[PDB]
Amino acid sequence: MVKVCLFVADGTDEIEFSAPWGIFKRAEIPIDSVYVGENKDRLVKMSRDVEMYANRSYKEIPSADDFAKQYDIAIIPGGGLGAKTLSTTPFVQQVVKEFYKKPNKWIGMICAGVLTAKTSGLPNKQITGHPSVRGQLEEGGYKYLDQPVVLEENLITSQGPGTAMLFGLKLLEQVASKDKYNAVYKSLSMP
Amino acid sequence: MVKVCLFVADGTDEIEFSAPWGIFKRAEIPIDSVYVGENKDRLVKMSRDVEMYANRSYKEIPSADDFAKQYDIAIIPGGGLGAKTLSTTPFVQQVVKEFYKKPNKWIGMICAGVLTAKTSGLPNKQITGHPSVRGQLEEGGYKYLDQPVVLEENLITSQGPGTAMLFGLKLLEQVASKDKYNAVYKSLSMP
């Protein structure tokens, strides 16, 4: 059974957090929110001011190697300020570098969260992200695709709050059986 | 200054709460989360286990007339348990009945939250909701439309987590200038 880590920081976007969270919960696949921040109660101020608790602090996990024995999917959501913090945290970079190209691991990044590919020195060729980070990614030698969701190797990237459902679904698609994926998909009333 | 109330209860769906929340926040339109439930600290256990503080408890608002003095838009999200609670709370029904067909008031319901139209006795002819409540809506006499969003008078109804962004947008469209609406829309990277 696959387990998912949804990273979260102060300033993480509520929509981009909620889509993969709700999708993996519907799929009955374990998922933990893992806070990168200093609040000792794991209380998070989200990008648009929702105050919510995370399940864990990243300080509970000693290394990317230990992280990899705990989780199979690592998700880095966006929101301007949350993405800045996540993309500049050495631990998150180490996890991303460790997971990349592993046959039993997957990475998701959405909106400004995709800056983590660049900061982690990932060598994928093609990518998407929020149009506001397009310049930054093309400087990193990435070919930017203007579409909701991109997959290269085991890195799923996505554009923004409007694509967070498609992003969560693409991650689920990698680990769910056909019947589980189809059932979850059908339950969402996708447009 | 348009002022939005996003109702929330234990068991409210994370995705359907976060979409209108983030959209109105982007539009710089004031929005409060207003909790209906037993928790005296406004700590809400959401449908898929997120624990989040609401801004207010509905108990702070002495009547539906007083609510109408404070808010112009009332939003009722889904999730099975959350919608059961909200749809069966007379305060919520009273707000919905008061707002219906009133100039410059708006009501939004999504997924199982649409049961509030039936419990409030709203005389709109057409409606949508989650396929899971399709029969029950039909039983109250509504004509069900299989499309993401239905607008009738000043009632916006919508289907499910997959349509929560289209739902939040349709609400925003009624109250924002075309210029503001287009800017918010553009920022979301809608597919």
UniProtKB/Swiss-Prot annotation, chains A, B:
Query: Where's it mainly located?
Result: cytoplasm
One term of GO molecular function: glyoxalase III activity
Q: What is the effect of changing residue 111 to A?
A: Nearly completely abolishes enzymatic activity
Entry's SUPFAM superfamilies? Class I glutamine amidotransferase-like (SSF52317)
Q: What are the record's GO terms for cellular component?
A: cytoplasm; cytosol; mitochondrion; nucleus
Q: Which reaction does it catalyse?
A: methylglyoxal + H2O = (R)-lactate + H(+)
Active site (catalytic residues) = 16, 111, 130
Q: What is the effect of changing residue 130 to A?
A: Leads to 5- to 6-fold reduction in catalytic efficiency
The EC number on file is: 4.2.1.130
| InterPro entries, per database record | Class_I_gatase-like (IPR029062), DJ-1/PfpI (IPR002818), Prot/Nucl_acid_deglycase (IPR050325)
Question: Per the UniProt entry, what is one GO biological process?
Answer: response to oxidative stress
Sections of the chain in a coiled coil: none
Where is the protein found, in the record's own terms?
A: Cytoplasm; Nucleus
Keywords of this entry:
Cytoplasm, Lyase, Nucleus, Stress response
Purpose: Catalyzes the conversion of methylglyoxal (MG) to D-lactate in a single glutathione (GSH)-independent step. May play a role in detoxifying endogenously produced glyoxals. Involved in protection against reactive oxygen species (ROS).
Q: Which family does it belong to?
A: Belongs to the peptidase C56 family.
> Under which name does UniProt file this protein?
Glutathione-independent glyoxalase DJ-1
The source organism is Schizosaccharomyces pombe (strain 972 / ATCC 24843) (Fission yeast)
